[PDB]
Amino acid sequence: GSCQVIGMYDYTAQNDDELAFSKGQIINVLNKEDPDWWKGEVSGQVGLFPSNYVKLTTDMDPSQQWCSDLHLLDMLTPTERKRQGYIHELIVTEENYVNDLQLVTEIFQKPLTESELLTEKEVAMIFVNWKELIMCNIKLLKALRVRKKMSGEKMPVKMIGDILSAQLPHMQPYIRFCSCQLNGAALIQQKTDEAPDFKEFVKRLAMDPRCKGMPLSSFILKPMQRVTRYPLIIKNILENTPENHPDHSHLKHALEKAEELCSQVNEGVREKENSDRL
């Protein structure tokens, strides 16, 4: 089964059929036949490598990636550490996510609603209820920030499910946005093909350093990506919350609201794509 590993030491290839890598480098594992020589790939290059020189990423403590600076982290149980780790993966990636949404508007939406290089409808077709998403997610973010503040600067957070359980219901605008992003994507391509003024303008918009080289056709995919990601993170938090824990019940409720949001979103996408045959 495909998975990632990180190099725990440097390794120079000793034979032509080997994969050389550096400490800290992540390599994609293609197979683990030989329990000593994994087949890996790094940047399109495939080779065998010593399995004892590597560490599965899934075996890495999540608190070490998302909150290594948490206070008293080393005093917590191994299971509460993972719980803090996943809680912070949720909060950190949310900050990351909300800011990217904002970024799209600032450097792509507004600069296009002024470009006059396309109608008022052609802007809705691409960004649809994008602004609406920024609103319900900013609400979530603010709520998480507050809980984070309530808990103490770099202090373990005890509850999170209540906020997610409460916040997920307002995520309904995603069904609409995700359902229409398929055309919005076609639109952007049509224009960047028929309107030379367009291809150039949107090419300039995208070179803003904060885009790190990502075209608007990929930023537009983020709302869907975020919706499918939630369940995954919430389930990991739940799994590290015992049933006698005061947040357990909320987490269970939140996982559920998150899973169906994702279902509703995916149903809408399919529905909308099917109706484009009638």
From Swiss-Prot:
Residues 82-268 form the DH domain. Residues 3-59 form the SH3 domain. It comes from the Eukaryota. It is found in: Endomembrane system; Synapse, Synaptosome; Cell projection, Lamellipodium; Cell membrane. Disruption phenotype: No visible phenotype, except that about 13% of the pups do not thrive. Mice are born at the expected Mendelian rate. Mutant mice display no obvious defects in synaptic responses to single stimuli at the calyx of Held. Repetitive stimulation gives rise to decreased synaptic responses, due to perturbation of the replenishment of release-ready synaptic vesicles. Detected in brain, adrenal gland and heart. Detected in neurons at the calyx of Held (at protein level). Isoform 1: Primarily detected in brain neurons. Isoform 2: Primarily detected in glia (at protein level). Widely expressed. Expressed at high levels in brain, heart and skeletal muscle. Overexpression results in the inhibition of the transferrin uptake and the blockage of the clathrin-mediated endocytosis. SH3-3, SH3-4 and SH3-5, but not SH3-1 and SH3-2 domains, bind to dynamin. SH3-1 and SH3-4 bind to ARHGAP31. Adapter protein that provides a link between the endocytic membrane traffic and the actin assembly machinery. Acts as a guanine nucleotide exchange factor (GEF) for CDC42, and thereby stimulates actin nucleation mediated by WASL and the ARP2/3 complex. Plays a role in the assembly and maturation of clathrin-coated vesicles. Recruits FCHSD2 to clathrin-coated pits. Involved in endocytosis of activated EGFR, and probably also other growth factor receptors. Interacts (via DH domain) with CDC42. Interacts (via SH3 domain 1) with WASL. Interacts with dynamin, SNAP25 and SNAP23. Interacts with clathrin-associated proteins and other components of the endocytic machinery, such as SPIN90, EPS15, EPN1, EPN2, STON2, FCHO1, FCHO2 and DAB2. Interacts (via SH3 domains) with REPS1 and SGIP1. Interacts with ARHGAP31. Interacts with ADAM15. Interacts with PRRT2. Interacts (via SH3 domain 4) with FCHSD2 (via SH3 domain 2). Interacts (via SH3 domain 1) with DENND2B. Interacts (via SH3 domains) with CBL. Isoform 2: Interacts with CBL and DNM1. This is Intersectin-1. It comes from Mus musculus. The gene is Itsn1. The chain holds residues 1151 to 1426 of 1714 of the full protein.
